[PDB]
Design a protein around this ligand. Structure first.
Ligand code: RHL
Length: 156
C-alpha cells in the first residue's frame, strides 16, 4: 500500500546512529501498549557488504527494555527489504537525506512507519515530511518523542 520509495538509495550511507523521533501505525493496537509488538526504538543501522541491513533496536518486553538485533534482507529493489517471519513483511525506505532523517515503513493490511533522525532534537522538517508521507496512508495512531525521552532506554 506504500507507494513512496526512495529513488537512488545508497544503503551504505544510512549506516550509523538513529533516533525514533515519531512512529505511526494503521491500527491502534500495534503501538498502544508499551509492550506492543511493533513499538520499537531504533538504535543503529548496520548495512552489510552484501547489502543486507542489520538493525539494532530496543523493545519493551516482559517489564524490561530489551536489545534486539534483526536482519532485513535485500531484494531486487534497493529501497525494499524483507524480514523473515511467520509472514512475509516488507521494510521500505520512503525517503532519506542520510545526514538528518530517514522515513521507513514496515508492512504485511497492517502498517507501521517511523521518522528516524540522527540527533536527539525535534526536527520539524523531518516531521512535516513524515506527516506528508503518511497522509496517503490509513494510520490511526501516531506517537512522537521529546529530546529527553530520545536519550532514554525505550524512550521512558
Ligand atoms: C532503513 C529503514 C530502517 C528499517 C528499520 C526496520 C525496523 C523493523 C523492526 C520490526 C521487526 C519487529 O518488530 N519484529 C518483532 C519483534 C517483536 C515481536 C514481534 N515482531 Rh515482527 N519480526 C520478525 C522478525 C524479527 C523481528 C520482528
Amino acid at each position: 500500500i506504500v507507494t513512496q520509495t526512495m529513488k537512488g538509495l545508497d544503503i551504505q550511507k544510512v549506516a550509523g546512529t538513529w533516533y525514533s523521533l515519531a512512529m505511526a501505525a494503521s491500527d491502534i493496537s500495534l503501538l498502544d501498549a508499551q509492550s506492543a509488538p511493533l513499538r520499537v526504538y531504533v538504535e543503529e543501522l548496520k548495512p552489510t557488504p552484501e547489502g543486507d541491513l542489520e538493525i539494532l533496536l530496543q523493545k519493551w518486553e516482559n517489564d524490561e527494555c530489551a536489545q534486539k538485533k534483526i536482519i532485513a534482507e535485500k531484494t531486487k529493489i534497493p529501497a525494499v527489504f524483507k524480514i523473515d517471519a511467520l509472514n512475509e513483511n516488507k521494510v521500505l525506505v520512503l525517503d532519506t537525506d542520510y545526514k538528518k532523517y530517514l522515513l521507513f515503513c514496515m508492512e504485511n493490511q497492517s502498517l507501521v512507519c517511523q521518522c528516524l533522525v540522527r540527533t536527539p532534537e525535534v526536527d520539524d522538517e523531518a516531521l512535516e515530511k513524515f506527516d506528508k508521507a503518511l497522509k496517503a496512508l490509513p494510520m490511526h495512531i501516531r506517537l512522537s518523542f521529546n529530546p529527553t525521552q530520545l536519550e532514554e532506554q525505550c524512550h521512558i
